[PDB]
Enzyme design. Structure first.
Site, PDB file in Angstrom:
ATOM      1  N   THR A  45       0.824  -1.204   0.000  1.00  0.00           N
ATOM      2  CA  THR A  45       0.000   0.000   0.000  1.00  0.00           C
ATOM      3  C   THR A  45       0.861   1.258   0.000  1.00  0.00           C
ATOM      4  O   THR A  45       0.529   2.249  -0.664  1.00  0.00           O
ATOM      5  CB  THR A  45      -0.938  -0.003   1.203  1.00  0.00           C
ATOM      6  OG1 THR A  45      -1.460  -1.326   1.398  1.00  0.00           O
ATOM      7  CG2 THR A  45      -2.078   0.977   0.979  1.00  0.00           C
ATOM      8  N   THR A  46       1.960   1.243   0.754  1.00  0.00           N
ATOM      9  CA  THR A  46       2.889   2.366   0.745  1.00  0.00           C
ATOM     10  C   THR A  46       3.561   2.544  -0.609  1.00  0.00           C
ATOM     11  O   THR A  46       4.041   3.642  -0.909  1.00  0.00           O
ATOM     12  CB  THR A  46       3.943   2.181   1.837  1.00  0.00           C
ATOM     13  OG1 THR A  46       3.317   1.640   3.002  1.00  0.00           O
ATOM     14  CG2 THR A  46       4.573   3.510   2.204  1.00  0.00           C
ATOM     15  N   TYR A 109     -13.463  -3.240   0.174  1.00  0.00           N
ATOM     16  CA  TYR A 109     -14.655  -2.720  -0.499  1.00  0.00           C
ATOM     17  C   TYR A 109     -15.843  -3.682  -0.528  1.00  0.00           C
ATOM     18  O   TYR A 109     -16.966  -3.274  -0.206  1.00  0.00           O
ATOM     19  CB  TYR A 109     -14.316  -2.280  -1.924  1.00  0.00           C
ATOM     20  CG  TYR A 109     -15.479  -1.643  -2.639  1.00  0.00           C
ATOM     21  CD1 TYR A 109     -15.905  -0.364  -2.306  1.00  0.00           C
ATOM     22  CD2 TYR A 109     -16.165  -2.325  -3.638  1.00  0.00           C
ATOM     23  CE1 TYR A 109     -16.976   0.224  -2.954  1.00  0.00           C
ATOM     24  CE2 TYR A 109     -17.240  -1.744  -4.293  1.00  0.00           C
ATOM     25  CZ  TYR A 109     -17.636  -0.470  -3.945  1.00  0.00           C
ATOM     26  OH  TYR A 109     -18.697   0.113  -4.592  1.00  0.00           O
ATOM     27  N   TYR A 135      -2.867  -9.288   6.335  1.00  0.00           N
ATOM     28  CA  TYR A 135      -2.812  -7.843   6.545  1.00  0.00           C
ATOM     29  C   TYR A 135      -4.223  -7.368   6.867  1.00  0.00           C
ATOM     30  O   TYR A 135      -5.112  -7.421   6.010  1.00  0.00           O
ATOM     31  CB  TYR A 135      -2.246  -7.117   5.319  1.00  0.00           C
ATOM     32  CG  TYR A 135      -2.074  -5.613   5.474  1.00  0.00           C
ATOM     33  CD1 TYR A 135      -2.140  -5.000   6.722  1.00  0.00           C
ATOM     34  CD2 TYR A 135      -1.837  -4.808   4.366  1.00  0.00           C
ATOM     35  CE1 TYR A 135      -1.985  -3.635   6.858  1.00  0.00           C
ATOM     36  CE2 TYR A 135      -1.679  -3.440   4.494  1.00  0.00           C
ATOM     37  CZ  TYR A 135      -1.751  -2.859   5.742  1.00  0.00           C
ATOM     38  OH  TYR A 135      -1.589  -1.498   5.875  1.00  0.00           O
ATOM     39  N   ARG A 140      -9.097   1.003   6.080  1.00  0.00           N
ATOM     40  CA  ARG A 140      -8.947   1.064   4.633  1.00  0.00           C
ATOM     41  C   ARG A 140      -9.817   0.059   3.895  1.00  0.00           C
ATOM     42  O   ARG A 140     -10.270   0.351   2.784  1.00  0.00           O
ATOM     43  CB  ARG A 140      -7.483   0.817   4.235  1.00  0.00           C
ATOM     44  CG  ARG A 140      -6.520   1.957   4.497  1.00  0.00           C
ATOM     45  CD  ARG A 140      -5.121   1.544   4.050  1.00  0.00           C
ATOM     46  NE  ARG A 140      -4.169   2.651   4.049  1.00  0.00           N
ATOM     47  CZ  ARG A 140      -4.045   3.526   3.056  1.00  0.00           C
ATOM     48  NH1 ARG A 140      -4.816   3.424   1.984  1.00  0.00           N
ATOM     49  NH2 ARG A 140      -3.152   4.499   3.133  1.00  0.00           N
ATOM     50  N   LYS A 164      -0.198  -8.987  10.027  1.00  0.00           N
ATOM     51  CA  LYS A 164       0.270  -7.634  10.235  1.00  0.00           C
ATOM     52  C   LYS A 164      -0.938  -6.769  10.566  1.00  0.00           C
ATOM     53  O   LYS A 164      -2.036  -7.057   9.816  1.00  0.00           O
ATOM     54  CB  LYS A 164       1.013  -7.032   9.024  1.00  0.00           C
ATOM     55  CG  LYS A 164       1.065  -5.517   8.988  1.00  0.00           C
ATOM     56  CD  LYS A 164       1.236  -5.070   7.552  1.00  0.00           C
ATOM     57  CE  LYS A 164       1.529  -3.572   7.420  1.00  0.00           C
ATOM     58  NZ  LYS A 164       1.811  -3.132   6.075  1.00  0.00           N
ATOM     59  N   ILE A 205       6.216  -3.892   9.978  1.00  0.00           N
ATOM     60  CA  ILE A 205       6.286  -3.524   8.568  1.00  0.00           C
ATOM     61  C   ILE A 205       5.981  -2.034   8.544  1.00  0.00           C
ATOM     62  O   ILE A 205       4.816  -1.624   8.615  1.00  0.00           O
ATOM     63  CB  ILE A 205       5.315  -4.330   7.697  1.00  0.00           C
ATOM     64  CG1 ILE A 205       5.723  -5.804   7.677  1.00  0.00           C
ATOM     65  CG2 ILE A 205       5.287  -3.786   6.282  1.00  0.00           C
ATOM     66  CD1 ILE A 205       4.732  -6.696   6.950  1.00  0.00           C
TER      67      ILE A 205
END
Ligand SMILES: [Mg+2]
Ligand SMILES: [Mg+2]
Ligand SMILES: [Mg+2]
Ligand SMILES: [Mg+2]
Lengths: 296, 296, 296, 296
Positions: A45-46, A109, A135, A140, A164, A205
């Site tokens: 994502t980063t 989503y 994750y 989000r 994570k 992370i």
């Protein structure tokens, strides 16, 4: 179970004239290696996974695997999707490019059920023979992988070895390690890196480690070696940058910091991401001035 | 402004042996047309956009465009993405294949800023010459299109004509239509269809209309002709089915209902979506028995 | 059932040198009566219920009862507590002083269960023979009176005739009036007065009406007679003042507005309530300039 | 600064035929003393502060002061209110009855601003010369004491020495102790007792210690002695009971547990609190079965 733990970096993806800067990507990954980092997370994502093509996804995973080759540094590739068939494809593809493991975000989503999350991740685990790290980031994704779902997946499939967590819920981090103490809980929230590690967490992370890789690794390794007073000291002095790096949605602040520090050449995002407000630009630059930023 | 308003349906996408059942899809769309529905929305969230391929995406839009040809029913095609480049691509694609407009959900998971949300929708708006309807669903996207961003977009790009709101925030709908009464507010939450319409809302994009299109059609047109007592009576009578059609994540309950009503032949989802509970299954079946479900 | 509906005002309690300004209090209630208000709410949340003594509680109820003597204006006295035995005392007491009914806030802080909430209100209703209006505002109390708990109380207890909702949940307002259409739903959120009224609500307990009593009453009666276009026009025009009256905790903004308009003599609160920020002070002065504030 | 830290117990208040069982109260306080507790907190939220009278408030503080005569165990009396004049009065009376310090809950329901909260506690701090501990629990009060307000109060008033946190926000506890490492952070959430202690917190104010005082005391002292392996061991074993003690609102589960364990003699609450559902009643007894409950 084979695991990938320790201090890990969610790498930014530098752009130059709309294309992935393959030279900066390699340069940034060898800067991480030279500062005690244990693993790198490409195209997460980063790294603006959402606006990258499938061929850019492959290129940066390949650059990571090659730049780490020979070192002890592992590559935990981002390979997730809210479509199960696609998530399995991305997992198999990641393995074919030399990744040591995959980080797979909870489907976003479409809000799958707890039952659906189990079947989603079970299919991914059976596609490959490399470690799989879940994750969970409900802010989000709009969904939550429950503690019972995480533990069920850990016990039922070999390659699933932990999760994570980016949920700001230290209650859940006690819940996990109290009912399943063998899993690897990884912090995905830089501000609370030490509290998660002090409860038995085995790695982070991080976003902050893009700018200050030496400090995040020292924090992580201090804690793993049970020197909690020196780990907390670094976590305490990292709080200000840890918060301001999320003044706007990640990775907008961290790329601004990397650009201001001269570690990347252009402050480019791919829409719908954009440059920060003028006010936050100054606030990021100001907070940066109190940390010594390691060079190349 | 060119607009697409009235009673509209977020179409389910029936599967049979893992593939899109193209013949039921057309049959279902002609069931919507024959029951007073003004427009249909192919490959939206209710149509499992996330697990469909580009080639199926186009197929269901083509089937929608083809079956509404000769009728008065418009096709408001789902064409949204958390990547602006793809959202522009998906929007252009819909126009080239005969859609009358596009429904474009706010970018999910990646959380663009309000400035980024503006530039995202501006790029989509300048790409096509058909109406563009914004879709705000923060519980699913993790981001919220602020009232000022919606109003700025409505005034700055003319093909943007309104917003579909699934926010559980009737305050925001008063905010919107009090400061910009010329925009088209569309209800994206079946339970509060009447309150949104009575405040100046001009249409609905419904889930319940999959099962009871005649009742949702009567509700919308009653409200548009200002017969509020006759509109509210239907809204009050639909409350029970409106709630349990979300006992699990949409479209899990409505597809279950369509299967129980005999309107589709198989209760298939694509992972991470799955069949609901055995208990949610039984309470969906119970509530259905208090409504008259029109056949073919 | 005996009911108290229509346009109602949550009265502020003006202070002077740490004491209740008893003559301004009567004057303020006489300004409400002369501007079409149907009932007044002494010693509510807007009247700083928490920082008044029991003898000031009585004084303000008595001033209200005496000032509405001879008129058609009802007294809906604030008589609530998170301790049931005290709430019963306040209810018995309010009736003994001529109040026409009581508004009883949901128990705050101690978070009773729905069962506990049921027994709480059952004791109050069986204590007196005047109408009882429940008051649900979870943001302030930390608890929610469920739709089924409200309906059970309405059907089981003679005196309980409705609820004053300040929850920003128009879904819940459909839920209530669709399953129990005989109850009196009272809006406790000025910004959404019209949407609640258009769904069958029968009155408001307003904060803005302290400043603009004529406008809130016109809104209410326009809506109650069904001229909804006329009611919505006033609600849309009142949005700005309705929102800015909550830039800080109520009643901090409204007392500031009443002071700027010259309707009260000193801007005094009892701690922990205090004067607003310099910036919020200026913003209230802005918004007031777009409305005609009736004098004495 | 004079401080009161370590393992502390938020005492339940047993009732018998509608009256405070004073005799039973003392017997329970001496059971806490006999199991390593450093201080006990009378008439807090766990002691049903809301439904006790002012003289019962005095009775239970006095019994605590008398029962801790001769021991090193301190009395941290609950003396708080959402009215500042009352909060100052309750503090003075608490000191006049021999209490060692004050626990002052944040003003509930009336939601004071940050500015108002400062003056609230400043009045309380300047009222007495004994330590004052702030209590932030936003889920019940509807307000949040900001980190900057806590730090300002700590530096500006001598007797304010820390805050008790029940916010489920481990980020905020890093925020506090990184910007003001001299304050005493006390955990008010049993499940995350160790993480708060492991970040530099110096004590707990517990609910579980009513049932298992020896385990909570051992946890705290292990942590205070920097033996983090043994502190986490106890915290992990207490997670199940810690969570089931909040399946319903505190103190409903803990009083049920004390009654099932035979430590209190009748299961009485004061309305609006009541006995739990049969279903939750059975869940508490089950979770209890894996712990050794010390007797008298
Ligand atoms: Mg690949
Ligand atoms: Mg056409
Ligand atoms: Mg007509
Ligand atoms: Mg307020």
């Amino acid at each position: 179970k084979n695991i990938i733990i320790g201090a890990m970096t969610a790498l930014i993806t530098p752009f130059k004239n709309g294309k992935v800067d393959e030279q900066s990507y390699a340069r940034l990954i060898k800067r991480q290696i030279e500062n005690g980092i244990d693993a790198v997370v490409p195209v997460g994502t980063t790294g603006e996974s959402a606006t990258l093509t499938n061929e850019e996804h492959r290129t940066c995973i390949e650059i990571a695997v090659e730049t780490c080759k020979g070192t002890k540094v592992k590559v935990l590739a981002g390979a997730g999707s809210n479509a199960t068939h696609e998530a399995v494809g991305l997992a198999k593809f990641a393995k074919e490019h030399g990744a040591d493991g995959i980080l797979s975000v909870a489907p976003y989503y479409n809000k799958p059920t707890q039952q659906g999350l189990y079947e989603h991740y079970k299919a991914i685990a059976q596609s490959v023979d490399i470690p799989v790290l879940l994750y969970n980031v409900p802010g989000r994704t709009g969904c939550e992988i429950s503690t019972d779902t995480i533990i069920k997946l850990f016990r039922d499939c070999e390659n699933i070895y932990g999760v994570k967590e980016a949920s700001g819920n230290i209650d859940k981090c006690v819940d996990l390690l109290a009912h399943e103490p063998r899993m690897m809980l990884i912090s995905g929230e830089d501000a609370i890196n030490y509290p998660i590690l002090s409860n038995g967490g085995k790695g982070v992370i991080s976003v902050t480690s893009n700018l200050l890789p030496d400090m995040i690794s020292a924090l992580t390794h201090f804690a793993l070696d049970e020197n909690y007073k020196e780990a907390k000291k670094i976590n305490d002095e990292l709080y200000n940058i840890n918060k301001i790096l999320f003044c706007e949605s990640n990775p907008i602040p961290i790329k601004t910091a990397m650009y201001l520090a001269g570690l990347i050449e252009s402050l480019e995002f791919r829409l719908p991401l954009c440059s920060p407000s003028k006010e936050n630009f100054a606030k990021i630059e100001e907070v940066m001035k109190k940390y010594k930023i390691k060079g190349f």
